[PDB]
Ligand binder design. Structure first.
Ligand SMILES: O=c1[nH]c(=O)c2c([nH]1)n(C[C@@H](O)[C@H](O)[C@H](O)CO)c(=O)n2CCCCC(F)(F)P(=O)(O)O
Ligand SMILES: O=c1[nH]c(=O)c2c([nH]1)n(C[C@@H](O)[C@H](O)[C@H](O)CO)c(=O)n2CCCCC(F)(F)P(=O)(O)O
Ligand SMILES: O=c1[nH]c(=O)c2c([nH]1)n(C[C@@H](O)[C@H](O)[C@H](O)CO)c(=O)n2CCCCC(F)(F)P(=O)(O)O
Ligand SMILES: O=c1[nH]c(=O)c2c([nH]1)n(C[C@@H](O)[C@H](O)[C@H](O)CO)c(=O)n2CCCCC(F)(F)P(=O)(O)O
Ligand SMILES: O=c1[nH]c(=O)c2c([nH]1)n(C[C@@H](O)[C@H](O)[C@H](O)CO)c(=O)n2CCCCC(F)(F)P(=O)(O)O
Ligand SMILES: [K+]
Ligand SMILES: [K+]
Ligand SMILES: [K+]
Ligand SMILES: [K+]
Ligand SMILES: [K+]
Ligand SMILES: [K+]
Ligand SMILES: [K+]
Ligand SMILES: [K+]
Ligand SMILES: [K+]
Ligand SMILES: [K+]
Ligand SMILES: [K+]
Ligand SMILES: [K+]
Ligand SMILES: [K+]
Ligand SMILES: [K+]
Ligand SMILES: [K+]
Ligand SMILES: [K+]
Ligand SMILES: [K+]
Lengths: 146, 146, 146, 146, 146
């Protein structure tokens, strides 16, 4: 995937988990021959789509990373709705894969188990990056060349 | 339906169930006189809409196939929301039927029962392909000729 | 309403209830002076929006008819979400009333009770056609004439 | 506020409660010295957005009035989804305030208590009309002038 | 951030809490070198998106502030849906961060605890303003300059 132009936008709310997701995404990229993806940090998940929109103008794939954990109020629901609506719109507006590596969990324990920290069962940041690269390559093959 | 240009995009997440959906889809297409539909694989359901969008540009119908099974977190809900929002937008943007053969189940048992395996109650992949082809033929008759 | 150009698109999933809805729609149309509305059948509710979009280009109102009954899986929810998002978009894109006569029930008995059979409490097919025609006539009044 | 061009669109479903909302709306408009608002009736809440779209072309603000009361089926949910999606889209397409005076209650008593009868705790018809007028005035001040 | 043009739109439903969110927003802005953000008041949360849309034409970031507290009817859900859908669209239409500082809580107690009063656990008005400003600065760096 060495010719793929990859961007990663990672939210910061939930610093340690977000750092873990970003590390996983960056390692997949480097594993795939990309040592220099564009990496941008934003404060919360709601800020991701507008930045992803900008990044989609100059990249073949964008990986969105973040962590949303339910609390005591309906806020969780609306944060997640905004992200889903935003990322879906951006991908289709730009005809560019925007992989969703934004964790949406009920508990912190669940988020930790999915961030690819040392004891985690999985890494959604890494998975989201494979998805982004694989889709970019597939689109490259489907589009105009001769 | 021998003149209809059909594309099938299939998510890889639950590989065995996805293989089963694709088999049903392909057999329907072949029975209707189409031995060579455009078949594209993607990694996860979220990746389907952007690829479906590309395929809608030069096909009369697109069949989306995949399997989303609910787990411990709200992830299931947001994957399904993205797929719904995306496929709906793509079909209307492109004025092209995008048939939904993306299983959205609570259990693996339920998904298996709907993948048209020897013992399955039904085959969602075959059903979605019938729907895509029937709708394309209907649109052809509705539109400009002769 | 003899001057209004009416289309009716009806899904075939749950055939007898759909037939019942279509009968109610046709009777209202005839009563309002329209013996020959454009009637198109599709396989499932998900196929309605793209066909409604096509019909909206050539008609003053479209009636969407269908039956979606909840089963074992979350699939009901997303089918209904798709229908709602699609018809809403189509109505506003085309500035054309698209009446929602798509039943969304928990049981078959509920669906029967709203299909306007001899024993039914109401006829949603008839209701949706009144809604479509009334709204078309209202828009005709509000828009440019002399 | 005497120079704002106001339109009101009110659905007819639950006629008495719909009339109460409308009286509250008209009272506010008269109280603010408005030239007779454009008043349009539609059959059900789903018809409101397309008519509000037409009204927004010729008015500084639109008040949407209606009553949706939950029953036995999931249909309440999808009616409200459609209204929410439609009105939000119309407001933004037209850059015009569309005030949401559409009651969404679980019971008839709840709707009555919010419709501005002598014994009502609230008057949501009046409130929506205040919001419409205020927002129109705010926009006028924000936009281009001497 | 002294060169960023900031706008704040604040709903007046729940006056005291709104004032508190606004104070947090203004303090963050002042701390980052902005003493004079554009501040606009609206009556309800549903009015925010149309005003944010106007503000986005003339500003680098917009902070939406407000308070939606659940009551006895589903109406809370649809207000929050409208705000979520609206703000998300406005941000992407305008390619401008629209920060969501609209509290969505089950109780008045919860809203007070998130408004940054003296004994509050957090200040979401302050948080939303940091988000808006950080995202504007990020976008400035990503976009065209020499
Ligand atoms: O990445 C995130 N992850 C998050 O978990 C998050 C974020 N972001 N934001 C806010 C953020 O998305 C925006 O920056 C903010 O709304 C301003 O735009 C949140 O308010 N949250 C908290 C959502 C859950 C609310 C809760 F804290 F659990 P509560 O106890 O208030 O219900
Ligand atoms: O076809 C799928 N089928 C799926 O079941 C799926 C997919 N895809 N993706 C993610 C995938 O769609 C994207 O590739 C990813 O978000 C990157 O964009 C998932 O996270 N899932 C799992 C959703 C359910 C998560 C769960 F495992 F059940 P959990 O226990 O974490 O709640
Ligand atoms: O009119 C309908 N009415 C329907 O009830 C329907 C339809 N259509 N479709 C599918 C259909 O909308 C599309 O043709 C298909 O997805 C291909 O695009 C469905 O899958 N359904 C079934 C939804 C209910 C799910 C269930 F069958 F009960 P389950 O037990 O699998 O949850
Ligand atoms: O203003 C309304 N208020 C309403 O309460 C309403 C409306 N409209 N419509 C239908 C109507 O919006 C459209 O005219 C129709 O779908 C055709 O487009 C409804 O079906 N309803 C009722 C929703 C269904 C609830 C119920 F009838 F009680 P049920 O027991 O069937 O769940
Ligand atoms: O900022 C707000 N905060 C709010 O809490 C609010 C607002 N606004 N609006 C209405 C408002 O958004 C609009 O101005 C109105 O719909 C007209 O467009 C409301 O109806 N509410 C009340 C929502 C909850 C309703 C309830 F009071 F809990 P109920 O008991 O009626 O269900
Ligand atoms: K791109
Ligand atoms: K929790
Ligand atoms: K990691
Ligand atoms: K090619
Ligand atoms: K096509
Ligand atoms: K499960
Ligand atoms: K099969
Ligand atoms: K038309
Ligand atoms: K059932
Ligand atoms: K009937
Ligand atoms: K006129
Ligand atoms: K206007
Ligand atoms: K009830
Ligand atoms: K701007
Ligand atoms: K409460
Ligand atoms: K404060
Ligand atoms: K740059």
């Amino acid at each position: 995937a060495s010719g793929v132009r990859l961007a990663i936008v990672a939210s910061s709310w939930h610093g340690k988990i977000c750092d873990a997701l970003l590390d996983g995404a960056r390692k997949v990229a480097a594993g795939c021959g990309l040592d220099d993806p564009t990496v941008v940090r934003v404060l919360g998940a709601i800020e991701i789509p507008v930045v992803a929109q900008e990044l989609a103008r100059n990249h073949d794939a964008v990986v969105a990373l973040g962590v949303v954990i339910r609390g005591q109020t309906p806020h969780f629901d609306y944060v997640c709705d905004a992200v889903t609506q935003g990322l879906t719109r951006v991908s289709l507006d730009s005809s560019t894969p925007i992989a969703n590596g934004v964790l949406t969990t009920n508990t912190e324990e669940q988020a930790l188990d999915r961030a690819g920290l040392p004891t985690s069962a999985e890494d959604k940041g890494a998975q989201a990056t494979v998805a982004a690269l694989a889709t970019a390559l597939t689109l490259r093959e489907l589009r105009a060349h001769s």
